[PDB]
Amino acid sequence: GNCFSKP
Amino acid sequence: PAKTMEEASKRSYQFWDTQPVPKLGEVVNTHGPVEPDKDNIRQEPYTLPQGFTWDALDLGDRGVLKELYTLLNENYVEDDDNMFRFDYSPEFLLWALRPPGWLPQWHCGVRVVSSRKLVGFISAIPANIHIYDTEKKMVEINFLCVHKKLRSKRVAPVLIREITRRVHLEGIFQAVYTAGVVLPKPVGTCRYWHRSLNPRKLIEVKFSHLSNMTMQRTMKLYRLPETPKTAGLRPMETKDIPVVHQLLTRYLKQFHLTPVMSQEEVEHWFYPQENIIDTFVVENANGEVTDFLSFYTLPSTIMNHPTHKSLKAAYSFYNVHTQTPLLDLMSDALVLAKMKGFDVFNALDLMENKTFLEKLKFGIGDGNLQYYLYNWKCPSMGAEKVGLVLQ
Ligand SMILES: CCCCCCCCCCCCCC(=O)SCCNC(=O)CCNC(=O)[C@H](O)C(C)(C)COP(=O)(O)OP(=O)(O)OC[C@H]1O[C@@H](n2cnc3c(N)ncnc32)[C@H](O)[C@@H]1OP(=O)(O)O
Ligand SMILES: [Cl-]
């Protein structure tokens, strides 16, 4: 889904 | 571009203030359209800046699909650190952009007039949406993208008004979409969580950082079994399409924002396609399919080392449980993703996902995913009531 997250 | 609601409260929205959406400050207690359905629609496309023109992209043309892939691979969404960018494949794009009911005019491109180079895109696909007590035919908006050299020129509002016009021409007046930025006005806010599967590579590409544990201690922490534990787990097959449709329809009734899929749509979204979508069903000792799990494939270009192998990520899709505990279902999803060579498994905190995220050692990501409705004013909801996953 059109959001790029990472920790 | 505001990322939090506190930042967004301080600014004004030159474009979105003109649109049929609630105001950011509004607390909404009604349910329904902001403006009436239009019985006459502008026949002419909206005006683009000088030297640019509209073009509907025929994705069945391999060369045109390659142009779209190339635009998105070089200019689409990046993480907040600008280190990784989604690497949608051409086969993935066909899956996401040609579901049942797709229209060519809803693959809305912008090209340079003289060179025909593709420099902008936005898409709509049809979807029946259940929102609280109403089922409405809508479109899902995705893949809004403006070339990096064309940014901050107010091309995005023109793209949005033009796809709006083309959807209106087909008699549809509501839309759903998600974005990492805060706009008027989110119906729900979700957060991405990540589950390391190959911790070595994640540390190397700086996707994650060695938290103080050793590399050896980290790999042992995230170790997974080599085979799933659930009895009867197997890939979804053609004969499973009706029961998967049946299982999904009942399961989604407990949430407040969900898709309403036909059996043909279920086949499209869930029938397994290598490197695109994986679906596994649980067939019990009676031969009854009682649960299923699914996740789609979306790798990411490593921006700083763009020569090298991309980060391979799985994204949780829809997971339905009636006999297998959801915790066990998702544990098998992790094991299956590890087997298939994924580096990380991503999931949102929507639906019932908060019941397993911490227990299965997901770590919380940075930045939110906001959900939005266009021309539909309704109360916001918590993440656990959102039952809609877009690609
Ligand atoms: C009935 C049918 C209706 C159908 C339509 C339903 C609505 C569909 C809505 C779209 C759903 C998209 C779903 C997805 O695909 S979400 C993915 C969005 N894509 C990307 O993030 C890719 C990388 N970024 C880009 O390509 C550009 O930065 C984009 C194209 C995003 C903006 O280009 P640029 O940076 O050059 O900006 P501008 O100068 O042209 O214009 C700035 C104006 O645009 C507002 N803005 C910025 N980002 C978004 C955004 N993500 N959604 C809605 N609006 C956005 C911004 O607040 C401002 O408005 P206001 O602040 O002045 O008010
Ligand atoms: Cl509200």
Author numbering:
A (entry chain F): 1 to 7
B (entry chain A): 105 to 315, 317 to 496
Reproduce text from the manuscript describing this model.
Glycylpeptide N-tetradecanoyltransferase 1, commonly known as N-myristoyltransferases (NMTs, EC 2.3.1.97), are universally conserved eukaryotic enzymes responsible for a major post-translational modification (PTM), myristoylation (MYR). NMTs are thought to transfer a C:14:0 acyl-CoA (MyrCoA) exclusively to the N-terminal glycine (Gly) of specific substrates. Here we report a series of high-resolution HsNMT1 structures co-crystallised with MyrCoA and reactive substrate peptides. These structures reveal snapshots across the entire catalytic mechanism including the reactive intermediate state, thereby providing the high-resolution map of MYR reaction chemistry.
To challenge whether only unavailability of the free amino group was responsible for Cα3 rotation leading to ε-MYR, we determined the crystal structure of HsNMT1 in complex with an acetyl-Gly-Asn starting peptide. As expected, there was similar rotation to the N-acetyl-Asn peptide. Occurrence of a free amino group by either Gly or Lys is crucial for proper orientation of both chains towards the pocket for aa3 or the active site.
